[PDB]
Amino acid sequence: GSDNAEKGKVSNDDASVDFVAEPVKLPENQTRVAFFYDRAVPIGMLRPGQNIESTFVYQENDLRLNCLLLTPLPSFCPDSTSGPVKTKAPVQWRWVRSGGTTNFPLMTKQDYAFLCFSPFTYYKCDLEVTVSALGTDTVASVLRWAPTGAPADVTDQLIGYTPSLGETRNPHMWLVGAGNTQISFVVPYNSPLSVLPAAWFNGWSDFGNTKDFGVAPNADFGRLWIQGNTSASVRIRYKKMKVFCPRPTLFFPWPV
Amino acid sequence: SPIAVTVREHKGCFYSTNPDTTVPIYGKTISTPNDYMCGEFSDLLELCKLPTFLGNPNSNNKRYPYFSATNSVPTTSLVDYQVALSCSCMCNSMLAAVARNFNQYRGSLNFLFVFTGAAMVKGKFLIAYTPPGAGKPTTRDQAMQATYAIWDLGLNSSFVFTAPFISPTHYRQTSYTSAASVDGWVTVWQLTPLTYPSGTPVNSDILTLVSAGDDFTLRMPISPTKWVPQ
Amino acid sequence: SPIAVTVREHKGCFYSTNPDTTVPIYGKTISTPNDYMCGEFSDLLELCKLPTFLGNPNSNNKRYPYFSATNSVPTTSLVDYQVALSCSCMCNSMLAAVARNFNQYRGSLNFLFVFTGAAMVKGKFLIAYTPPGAGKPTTRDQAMQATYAIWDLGLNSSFVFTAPFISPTHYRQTSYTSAASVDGWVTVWQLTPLTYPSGTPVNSDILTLVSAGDDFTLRMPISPTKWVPQ
Amino acid sequence: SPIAVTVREHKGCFYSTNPDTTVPIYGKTISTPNDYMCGEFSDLLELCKLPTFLGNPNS
């Protein structure tokens, strides 16, 4: 009943307060930050620019890359007054963008679900990654991972007829043979930062304050490089998620 | 010796929601300490109880965080919210924003009204909740027969109105997916006219917010029909 | 009876860093005894604390294990190291050599200076550490406003200067992978001129070494961009 | 270390009447309470004892 919104808050009632009624509440857990975000969701896909026997090289094709950034937020070959520089590794973008004329598909990669619904300012967690084959041919593929901020080491094949990506002390994966088609695994919160920005970082990324405003540095879970004969759908999963400082969700269009 | 195993028909299968973990490839990694942080929360449900704004449509059909009243008793209702998470005037409230990610709900909805007209203004309103079965009310008189409360203006600026959870089923679907369309209506009427003195703005604005009440819960996490902001 | 099993989607997959062991094919093999050995160590981190040489560039641009000073007070700084593992004058120190195999660091860097000029020579230096935010110092006067220490020549030949770990984040990236380029600078200035008597070499050389300080740590083992020695 | 296993000849096989359960994909879901209900039964056999009509044929 009667109250005062001015003070920053109000009585949070149930039927029994103003009327001859009562609390109808039942136990229920499924609405918890952790449990809720703890399910798999696609953010993009990987397409090999080259064989399992050669030297790897950044490669784009119809918005598809042979390498991808592990973050919920939007990403893509770095943008430029003259167009996204496709000869390079993807980076975090500040907005979502149509692949072409019509809205879909998207040029950018990201967790659309998480974007349309991230009721919070900061978050953190571990990331469980799943890489599933889109094709039906006996697979021969190599996958390389690296933590946020690490050298891409996108150098030349040392050993002929073998995959350059496999040539590293970093965590790499080798998948090959009939029936062997999906890669699954989990990586640690590997960022230099204490917590990550769910949406926006109200500051410059460089000391000169001239560049990339709104994007926090190393605000991601590292990245993936692929090589071999198979393209794959890539999904992420929020492990032991934690969120802070509540904020507004993505706007929804009012009915005409 | 090796253990003999029976390999189940469902092998090699991947489950988006599999209740189990997978292989760790970068172990013993410390998670950058964040003990300094404040503002943390665990349950999406709480966000639901924070009252946020209802979008009220204008003739030229554009939205306001409120509605207006004056020195008259409009024969019809001032505003009318349809108790239904899917419902549109809520399209943009935290309550609805969270609710669209879940299949079912239970419990009370709380409608919050805040009078922003001048201190010198007075008057009374009749807020009501009408359950289905006899159709939506078309007159204060009818509304008055269902669940209602009188709101009196005065020193205290606001009013919390609770739409009771009255239903056949223990739960209710959160979305207009096919058509039983609703779970009744919340209607606001003038009981007595807004009254005041000369020198006072004749048209007062009443802020309209909505939120999940105390009893309230959501369940079964799902995906909404995908959308694109305007 | 056989145990029924659910075969996970990720089968047949190989993990370079898999936290587990594999099949043994030549068991019960004794490992040639080496109990006589000395010089053993367990932590790469220790190698990090052993001071090694900084490579100081010459006009014709070639490197020296040191820098020179004389009977003057150069208006500008004598040498300036950029607190940044990736940084080049350290390119060849054990500290950097180890650090490039790890993604992040934390703690103090220790800069070691050794005076090799003649016993008869004297003088004082001003070593300083400047954190970012206001740009790198361009004058002793400015440097003097940040973290600093005065180094006095005398009987004792050397000096250990600590670049404090002052930072927004609990950790810092070890590599210049994209561009925030640095974590401040270490600058060396003359406070007073090197002074001495007739019959003494007017230009004294100061050995410059660097190492990880006590507080210091590294983490997340990785691979550096591959290289080829000249 | 991994456990060595002998994979039985009958693998990948599906059993309509398999005496065991399978993978759960929507856990922790409460089953809408129905404590109000009456008329419940457990054994098809009981239905058997309820006398019902015999169909007697005419010319």
Binding site: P27 | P19, D20 | - | D20, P24, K28, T29, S42
Partner: peptide
Amino acid sequence: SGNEGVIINNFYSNQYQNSIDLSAS
């Protein structure tokens, strides 16, 4: 009660393996 005859029959926690029974009143 049902058509299930396996001893090691747990692996997945009960509450995950089955809908949770709860009484309104």
